[PDB]
């Protein structure tokens, strides 16, 4: 799993299609892995929590950690949910 | 400088340094050609620089700050030197 994450981070857009693939597959072949619950909310929560964490990082001003977080698959344009950039 | 040199040989097609590794040594290049590339988000990147003899390699990383960018995979046989 470690190298899969470490290669999803570089080919983030590629893993982006990859989750597209798994979810569209759950749509079509529901007997494969749909027997559970929704996942799109979970990925959205991952993104939102990483956004809150980068908000905290900007509050701590950690240049190295902020750079690693942003380059790890974070959209810099996403501010605080209210709008605090 | 000469009193602390250690040799090393790589066949055409070896990865020497990339972004993952931080600076550890001063890889000097002897007779031979090593390809210098970087990475991109589309088929990565190709053709950054073709290092030749009587040149340096991996110097700015020790000069200013750690991490060695410009992923280099050798392309010809060469008797690279190495200084700590």
Binding annotation of A = 1-27
Rounded CA separation B21/B18 (Å): 6
Long-range CB contacts (< 8 A, 24+ apart) of A60-69? none
How far does A36 lie from chain B, in Å, by closest CA? 34
Rounded CA separation B45/B36 (Å): 10
Rounded CA separation B46/B62 (Å): 24
Q: Would the CB atoms of A13 and B39 count as touching at under 8 Å? A: no
Specify the resolution in Å. 3.4
Indicate the SS3 state at residue B5: coil
How were these coordinates obtained? cryo-EM
Rounded CA separation B60/B66 (Å): 9
From the list B55, B50, B57, the residue with the least C-alpha distance to B75 is B50
Structure tokens at B34: 């090593």
Q: Kindly report the number of other CB atoms within 10 A of residue A25's CB atom.
A: 13
With CA atoms as reference, the chain B residue closest to A9 would be: B41
Sign of CA dihedral A32, A46, A80, A68: negative
By the 8 A CB rule, do B74 and B67 touch? no
Q: Which residues of B touch A11 (CB under 8 A)?
A: 41
The region that residue B81 occupies, defined by phi over 0 for left and psi between -120 and 50 for alpha, beta otherwise, is beta
Rounded CA separation B1/A3 (Å): 39
Q: Which residues of A touch B39 (CB under 8 A)?
A: 10
């Amino acid at each position: 799993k470690q190298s899969f994450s470490n290669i999803l981070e570089i080919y983030f857009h590629d893993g982006r299609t990859i989750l597209n693939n798994i979810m569209e597959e759950k749509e079509s072949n529901d007997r494969i892995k749909k027997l559970e619950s929704d996942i799109v909310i979970h990925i959205g929560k991952q993104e939102a929590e990483l956004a809150l964490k980068v908000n905290s990082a900007a509050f701590q001003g950690d240049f190295y950690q902020l750079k690693s977080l942003i380059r790890s698959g974070a959209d810099p344009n996403k501010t605080d949910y209210d709008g605090r950039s | 400088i000469v009193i602390r040199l250690h040799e090393e040989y790589f066949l055409p097609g070896e990865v020497i340094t990339e972004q993952g590794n931080v600076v550890d040594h001063l890889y000097f290049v002897c007779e031979g050609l090593l390809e210098a590339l970087v990475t991109k988000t589309d088929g990565s990147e190709e053709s950054v620089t073709l290092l030749g003899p009587h040149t340096s390699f991996g110097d700015i990383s020790i000069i200013c700050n750690i991490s060695q960018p410009f992923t280099v995979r050798v392309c010809e046989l060469c008797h690279l030197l190495r200084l700590d």
